[model samples]
Target: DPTNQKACLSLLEDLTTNVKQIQDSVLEAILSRNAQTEYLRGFLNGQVDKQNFKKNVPVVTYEDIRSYIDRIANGEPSDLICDRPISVLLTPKLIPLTTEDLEQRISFSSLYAPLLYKHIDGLSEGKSLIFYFVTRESKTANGLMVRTMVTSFLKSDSLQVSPHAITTCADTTQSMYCQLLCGLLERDNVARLGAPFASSFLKVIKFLEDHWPELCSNIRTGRLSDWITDATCTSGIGKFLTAPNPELASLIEQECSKTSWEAILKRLWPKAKCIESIITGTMAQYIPLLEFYSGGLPLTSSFYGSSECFMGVNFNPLCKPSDVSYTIIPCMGYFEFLEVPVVVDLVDVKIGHDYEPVVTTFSGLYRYRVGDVLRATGFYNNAPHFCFVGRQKVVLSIDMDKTYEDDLLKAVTNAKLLLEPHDLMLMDFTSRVDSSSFPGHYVIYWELGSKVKFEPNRDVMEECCFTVEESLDAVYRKGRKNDKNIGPLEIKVVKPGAFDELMNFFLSRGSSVSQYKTPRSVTNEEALKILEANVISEFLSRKIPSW
Candidate 1:
């Protein structure tokens, strides 16, 4: 399944001696040049001597490496000279070249060395497997490939080969697993019968539960499996089997017995003996469902590979309730936790408490900051495990209280239970400190579905607002307070499509769906201003009178 068989094999040989030699040579070259590499060398030296490298080596970040590259390119050599070697830049290949190319290239070269080595190591171990579940065109595909190669080399003879299988449809509406099934069905391989869920099939079940109670009841009791299995009994097989939303399943359970969720679920499809859910991309927001299907013993696992860096396997595949905040995984890379924020020089840093994650990889990364905040839970021997808190930039600060994006997501999910079915989509949300406006307000901007009217139902709106407020308060109580001060919560309703407009603006700028995440907190003034402008524009366009 190796996509690049030549690279994979070559990497296997390289890992035995070339990787370490190159790393040492690069360090020696940089150090001899009096370039910015001295800072990195000094940092490295502080951790470990050359003989016992692993014990004292600190995690390196991309920013740290990039800074060194910048200095060297600008003709300032601290201890390293990077001009002569073939530089391997670790940046997204798709990014347009600009005036910053020199600096970007240097940083890329630093990380690329290790990334290459890791792949070589993985290949030698025989663990190298071609990853086809994710697309080759994806931004993280190259990174993932590099990691797989490295893991193979490192694991050596213990490596296992898995078939390269493509899962998920081109359209985002279909379940990734179902899409994979469809692909398999079309292949020359023998077609096996298995239960498949589709967005449309889910809708039919919901509809039947509400309108055709008899069929819903029969299905709940296991008598209507024959009817459901019949191609023409309900909606078409494709529709019935490929529903995206889980609300349809909930509807069935609601109208039927407590066990009806699983009972009806099993009766609907005759092909597969068991069902598992694979959450991808932003779908990590739906961790609650793992709790819902506990009785069926669902094989829950997070498809943690990304388009930017490929895949990282989760430590637990069964989704045991450890922490809902984040999943811990070890891929083919080295990760470092920064205890305190450091200057661009990567010197004079703090240590020990919660800090940002810095990464260096076998694919070519040196102290690269991945822009993720992780709270250390415990250690799996020497391996550090953590729960992903949220993005550092998206955290909301209310005077002295701070809330993260994950908290907001959990809060919104809780709030949804109090709102009308279709009205739960949170189009956009923002929060900031406004000193001029009596104290300040943590304002949330939301768009309700067309079926729901906010004007006539003030009580429901207040209830929703209070729910979010309480959720925020809970996070605050957990000791995540803002450096400034905490304030009262406020909710503002926007017209439909307002969120779409904002998202489109981002999309036009080349942001992909995977990067299209909702902001949890409007901490920065500029970010708040952008949110304000969008909200005002939405309000005026809707022709809704003044606030």
Candidate 2:
């Protein structure tokens, strides 16, 4: 009973083969409940079929349901938006989840656990080492719990590295240190190591790079660091450090002191089969560096979901990070594709085409725009497998040519290769359309990581900028060289901690660290100012593309 792998496999097979039936039953189950809800009762007017639901409930954004959510928070009946009593209020979208909705979410954990355990050998045998924080939950005005989907689901899964008992620590640095410290203690049993994001995992590795000596000393002596002053975290972490193993400490020191820390995870934890995190969309940018540290271990995206709805999971669990795709779980919600002129059923979506998702959750969101654009890579049995493209309408338009997030990410991915030789890593980046010049240009802000003093090499930097421009679409190239409608692409190398400040800015504005993501395009004036104020140096690609 380590994992209900047998049952999960059955669940997987049924989902892949009977997706059409599952989709139908899931829609009926949702509509049956939704038809009684106050929000959709008026729209459906009794008919609760897919056609009626789609035709009646026009596609709506979070803004459309904001009033309803507020009214519910203000003590209105829960039926105003949900069939069952709202179990949780999920944010930053603030979507209400019913008991039934929570049940579906929990069921997916079972479905995913087997898949995770299969690829990441010894996951159930031991445990994962994760750099995670457990944020305190608050209640709605009506007394419903308010938390993130990740927090809600982790409660049911026993496989993950839990941070529940030491919640009072509240100190991220100490908490991370203890997590890594505990991970190193059981290095052989640590089946996997990662955080909620690839970026966060990189932060963990960087933490080790800086503090491995202290960590090693503590390990060699069987004592906790004085920096860990929080009673709860100290006591909780102290239990595991009951005895020291100098051999382990020396082993860790040998690996940590290496001049080149390639495949550090493998060198340290030979039994760890793979790394896990959400490596899609904005998180995709962190893959190259994650690979650089992991030495090419498979990076599995645990699941594909958002606050709006739990969409899918990667059935092909051990694939390359670049080729990861999630096969939609039809029972999670009633899904439809916004394929421009009209919305179509998930069954009708074709491979190679991308579309915005309009989801109707079990709780009550009907024809809601999830705001992400996903491409149908192919299918798992009959269920379509999707690769996350980017956010909807997030792009760079300097002229008639518009460069999208996927293209920008591809360009950055290729351009970052130039940094490898220089022993630098692209830590984080964002872009903005700069219109200060006659012909506005796309300005990319990069925060890079280096071990030594990074002397600004103009030629190398300009070549990197040139690679970005040349890797973009032909339309952008044409505009840059032919029509001269767009100015040269500029790369501003911002000082270290610029992106951290950007993250903090969002956190100040109610963004949760547990679910926080770095924005790819910064259009907000205040946010743009943060990146601009942190400018260390700048480079531009004056060389036009020959194409």
Candidate 3:
């Protein structure tokens, strides 16, 4: 249990105090276990030598092991790569996970439990009101079940408001109301509120905005909607409605009806200690709206990892979203760092430099580049803490002007200030390099926030576009003003729920909602079609960028 403070403190002590020795031992353990495997034996002549393994095993990507993974999937024995049988296979890009591998990955949470215990007061006492969605998983040719990491997490003991029924359009609308009612019923016991991402949390507030009247009526009358006909769901949620709660119902109605919906979470669930989600990377864009809704509750970016392997945990859970850092856990995997200059061991990494983390996992991924760039922020004892930078190859470019993911986020973040005065919030955003004309410029798409039918003034929209252009990197600014090769930046505002349709498009094709991240840079044909189909308004940066 997370309430076990003794285990929490011990894990915290080991993570801080014995990082280097623990990490070194982890590598030795992996080598000892898998030395006889064909992959390891071929590379190192069957010797469990760390120096030889490092020297002989070249850094690899998914391409290098695609054949091996395919062969294993075709019913090859586990000895092809590792000694253990691969229990579960992860997708989009397949990553095999053994039982022990899953155990070690689950242990990544052990590192964060202590931090949550120290900062969030009611974490051990009350339940977290989490909004999550589930999907179907498929099986491999060799009978291995293919799934996402989130599917594994769902099997764990996290609390859920609705566990019996699922969602559709009318069902989704009712689902939102019933779920909110459940949380409202236990308002005093809800220690935290969260979703997998900030955007999903925003969607939660939007639903409440539209359905609070019905939700409050249900609470006031102790009645269930006629549409909520599922016996299991009715009974599961109806038990909470043993008595009417008109006082709580009226309070929610008053707060939700206000024109300015600021700090809504604090007012609704006064005992909720924090709002948790992945608020770093491009997801950071939604923080302003989340803070507006949360009323300044602690926004914790709890864990950091990739599809291939989990990397680390947030050591300081109460820190600002901008200042968050995850301390790499030694026991998670055999870790190495690819400093732009040299490949170094985890302990050898210095502060204030960005490095692409290379991981050697228990299953078969050896010295694999996860494609993420993480900046070394500081040290917790000997273990290095990292602030996520951006993924490699995710960029917007024209001529010599190149803008990376973090750069675009910075630009968009600075430009979003203009939206505040107009009472608009940036709900979701994505960009593309528009080269349909002679001079290619960046085309950005936005889905603005609303609880009412609202449209921004034309002048304000143009100003928002200009602010984005001016906030770009120096090279991009130079291209617009001095070089004159790039065209004016364009911002297209789409109709509300356009991004929701975009998410549904991916989910219909078998993407897991829990692990689904919004594509910051759009390239898919149908994806772009979805964004274009919903465009309600468009504006170009009328003002040129100043040198």
Candidate 4:
């Protein structure tokens, strides 16, 4: 890592300076490969140039280009999708993200190492970290590939993860926090902590919290209670350690006496420096809790990218949460922004308005709409910098009710005003459209911070539901009154730690720990079931007499 911060910062500035030209060159590289891809083959054909390529090629999604991926994966030897030869036919779903691409992703993040050193100056002298991410090896979608690529990325020595230091939370059968706590406590000074483990660390910290023996018991056993540590649980630590941390009793006693997570972390690993995690989209909700634990330490936004491609990164280590934004990597992929009425290139995007990013990749994706909503904040060098504004596809409609997360978030936030009487302040919430039974309905699992607590009854829930439903979309409101589908709205009050535990559950189930997100709206049954099993107490209010 560079001792001088300016060089690191200056290097990024210099690289991003001629970004537009860099992007154009990258565009030419992909197009020059051979327009044989059935999707964009015609545009790369000599008859169509870069400027006119848009006119010939339309934008598409994964579903739109999946067949090409399948054709290529099945070893059919087709130029219908990819022009470049694939190095591997990686699976459960076939995709091409080469080693070089993975290297690029890791490299972009290491630029922050100098910046990282600034925060951990006295703390991270002997760097050790636990990289925890979950995958159904999270859906079997690309878990194996993620596991393989990440392991190789670490071994590449680009990010400096040691073989002994490296651990995964993708294992479902193991207690996520137990292993994470055991792994985390072993570190001399944890250089970087990903959010999944960091967030769950908070949970287990509080869990093993007032109950000191539980932490000591788990520390002694390397496992949770028998029931919690069942078959669904698997080990990220392949070589089982029956021996507990020698310093555990002292560290626990010392940190247990401390008040803030900061003091505890400081006492545990005073050399501990920074937190590296995703904060874009719904994941932003976890930032506050993380900040609470950080005390005054730096909470670096993990360098931004996606399965689609390395889209952007934040150079300012101290960038504010609200002002958070990423400088788009125009050269990583052939770039274009969808502004609805038309599809436009980089320079054409408007600064305050939102746009959907459509990209073509060297990894064999063309004008692929990643379904993320990005709002341009301003420019970084010659290129554009944008902030991730929740997902464009976060919506739920059962029967005639067309409800999006935007409306729900706004409604719930607004309903806090209605809570003036209940004296209950809103902490966090998640919702889903439930149609498992007859006329489908909606369920909102709310975590409330209150002055006086009580098990909310039928009237209480109905009143709160009414206040929230008032702020809903016209479609949902109209459907309720008319002879149509949308059913009753129910409110389930969950324990304050429910969502954090939910994060823990998913990490245990193999969801991406670094990328774990609690959908603002329960998007599917898999999502809904995770919530159902964690429900605390609730009231069911139906339309008229339907309850």
TM-score, per-candidate, Cα-based: 0.47, 0.92, 0.91, 0.75
Better of 1 and 2 by TM-score: 2
lDDT of 2 by residue, 1-547 (tens): 0234445466677777887888888788777876777888878876768777767788888899899988887778888877778777877457887776787676667666776776665667767777666555778776878876666764541444434544335676777788778788878777777777887777778788899999999999998899888887888876678887899999999998888888898998887778888898889898777877887677888688877788988888788777989888887888999874678888889889988999988776888899989998999888998999988774788768877888898899889888878778888999999999978898999999864467667888898999999998888888888888889999999998899899879877766566777877888898988998999899999688867
lDDT of 4 by residue, 1-547 (tens): 1232335466665557877677777778777665666656555565335776777667887776777766655555446666655544332344666555566666666564564566446434655444443343221333223343443343442232323322433342234444445444555545555443334444434554555555556666665544344333333233334566546755666666664444454555455576666655665555555665565556666466666677877756566766778878665777789873588787778998788898878777777887888888898777788887767874667865666656676666565555546655555678877777567877788876543245555566676777677778777777766755766777888877677666766555544544455667755465566567767788665433211
Instruction: Rank all candidate structures by their lDDT, best first, as comma-separated numbers.
Output: 2, 3, 4, 1
- Candidate 1's C-alpha runs over 4 A off are 1-312, 320-331, 338-356, 375-385, 398-400, 420-436, 449-456, 473-487, 522-547
Candidate 1 C-alpha RMSD relative to the actual structure: 13.4
lDDT at position 489, candidate 1: 52
The lDDT values for all models are 0.37, 0.80, 0.79, 0.60
TM-score-based ranking, best first?
A: 2, 3, 4, 1
lDDT of 3: 0.79
Candidate 2 stretches greater than 4 Å from native = 1-9, 119-124, 154-163, 167-169, 398-401, 474-485
Cα error, residue 106 of model 3, in Å, equals 2.8
Please give the distance, in angstroms, between residue 460's alpha carbon in candidate 1 and its true position after superposition. 2.7
